[PDB]
Design a protein around this ligand. Sequence first.
Ligand SMILES: Cc1cc2nc3c(=O)[nH]c(=O)nc-3n(C[C@H](O)[C@H](O)[C@H](O)COP(=O)(O)OP(=O)(O)OC[C@H]3O[C@@H](n4cnc5c(N)ncnc54)[C@H](O)[C@@H]3O)c2cc1C
Ligand SMILES: Cc1cc2nc3c(=O)[nH]c(=O)nc-3n(C[C@H](O)[C@H](O)[C@H](O)COP(=O)(O)OP(=O)(O)OC[C@H]3O[C@@H](n4cnc5c(N)ncnc54)[C@H](O)[C@@H]3O)c2cc1C
Ligand code: HEM
Ligand code: HEM
Ligand code: NI
Ligand code: NI
Lengths: 214, 205
Amino acid sequence: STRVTRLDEKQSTSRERLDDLLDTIPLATVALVRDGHPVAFPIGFGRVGDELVIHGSTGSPWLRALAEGAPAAVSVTALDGVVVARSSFESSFRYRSATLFGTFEVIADDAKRGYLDALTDRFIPGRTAELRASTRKELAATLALALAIGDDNWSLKLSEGWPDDADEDIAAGGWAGVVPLTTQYGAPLTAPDVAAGTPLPPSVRGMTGELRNT
Amino acid sequence: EKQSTSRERLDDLLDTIPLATVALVRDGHPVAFPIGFGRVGDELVIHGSTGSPWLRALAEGAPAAVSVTALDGVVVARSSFESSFRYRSATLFGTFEVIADDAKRGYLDALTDRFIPGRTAELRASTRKELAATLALALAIGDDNWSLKLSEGWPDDADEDIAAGGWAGVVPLTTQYGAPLTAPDVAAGTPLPPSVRGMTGELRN
Ligand SMILES: Cc1cc2nc3c(=O)[nH]c(=O)nc-3n(C[C@H](O)[C@H](O)[C@H](O)COP(=O)(O)OP(=O)(O)OC[C@H]3O[C@@H](n4cnc5c(N)ncnc54)[C@H](O)[C@@H]3O)c2cc1C
Ligand SMILES: Cc1cc2nc3c(=O)[nH]c(=O)nc-3n(C[C@H](O)[C@H](O)[C@H](O)COP(=O)(O)OP(=O)(O)OC[C@H]3O[C@@H](n4cnc5c(N)ncnc54)[C@H](O)[C@@H]3O)c2cc1C
Ligand code: HEM
Ligand code: HEM
Ligand code: NI
Ligand code: NI
């Protein structure tokens, strides 16, 4: 269920490392079953304490399926680089990946406002304090859902090593190494309907460097 | 509509992003794994250990859903309701076919050349033992069995919010190769190979 089979010295049980990954990557891929068939869809998520939270239209069939109790598996992955070995067999990727399992719970109408504010502040930190409150109609058009991050329902796999070359290939010489991969925020692009010379909000001024989820 | 039907655009995404997430069903319940993939013409190809339980399930006929996503930006609107991510995502459905022993060498070389272009012509051939330890699987990309969602919009704010002012826009995200890191057991002054020197700028088509 939660135990890695292959290269299981890459499995980590640190919850702290888990949070670090979940607070870095804003995209999750969610898998569920419909009529015996698998389905998978990407979606933004934020970790709000010990819950993974998503949201979307109350009219999405996918989100409705989860709201109705479809058991789910949630995958979150950071691709950190390419492992260039002296053979193709030992070539690889550096990455960090988490997989979480359970049933999403529907956030109650009374709680949606608070979870959505916290979700927004994952995606664009400090943004909630800059915006107007959501309207009752906006909230009624939104389904928010939360999956519990417990002790037993998650697995973390970490690969950040170097090529592991056969001694034969070493002897032959040749270059080996890692080409890193990073995901970075670009300079912001102002929308055409924004008044000329309007400043960047502080929250957006923060969206610089390598992509994070807090 | 944000659903695209262009096979050319699908290929463009599959030739950009090397990570897939594969969903399948074990015991009426869902499982999801990340894996590297390459597009080899009209097949999406993955590989790993003959001893991996989940690759074995695929090999055994388990129907799959394969998701490939590129995150392109943060859509920052005047309201949190209208804020979102710019992204491209494909989902492909079907059953992976096991690649035959006689065919694996060719497919794995093609796969290598997706992940590190030009690299196979630089390396020695894989050994029989290496091949034998490897399971390679291919999912057909047909006319029917996929969908492509492309959201590359600007924020669409209500009139009342535009009139109230405030900034809005898009903060792009890009994924870039960094400077190579030479492994500890390589001699100082061994030059970078041509394949590696070609790996600069964006994770790119
Ligand atoms: C960016 C990236 C690229 C990858 N490319 C490849 C590839 O090209 N070939 C390949 O074989 N593998 C690749 N993997 C790893 C792949 O996800 C599996 O770890 C691998 O196939 C071995 O799985 P298994 O047989 O051990 O899992 P199984 O024994 O079938 O699964 C048992 C349990 O292990 C845990 N687990 C397994 N893998 C992961 C994971 N990756 N993250 C979190 N939890 C996990 C889960 O809880 C799971 O239910 C890649 C991973 C990442 C992040
Ligand atoms: C980076 C990223 C972040 C996202 N964040 C959010 C979010 O925060 N909230 C939210 O509601 N949605 C988000 N989405 C979109 C999500 O994938 C769905 O499009 C959305 O939940 C509505 O799905 P649906 O119920 O209309 O599709 P359904 O009607 O349930 O599915 C029908 C079929 O349409 C096709 N399809 C649907 N979506 C996609 C896709 N994305 N890629 C390829 N094929 C597809 C599939 O074949 C699917 O089986 C995000 C997508 C990306 C890539
Ligand atoms: C050239 C680029 C290649 C890349 C980027 C690549 C990447 C990977 C990755 C990411 C893994 C998963 C390791 C893990 O679980 O953490 C893996 C496993 C594996 N790859 Fe590759 N690979 C490549 C080429 C090859 C080739 C050519 C073969 C065979 C000839 C091969 C055989 C295997 C095998 C057998 C495993 C299973 C590892 C194990 O569980 O012991 N790979 N590969
Ligand atoms: C603040 C950061 C937020 C981000 C990054 C975000 C992101 C997204 C994304 C990516 C989508 C998918 C659009 C698509 O289908 O292509 C979406 C849909 C949606 N979001 Fe958000 N969102 C945010 C805040 C909010 C809030 C606070 C609400 C409600 C109060 C809201 C309500 C919705 C609704 C209803 C949809 C479905 C749109 C539709 O299909 O009609 N969002 N969001
Ligand atoms: Ni609030
Ligand atoms: Ni060949």
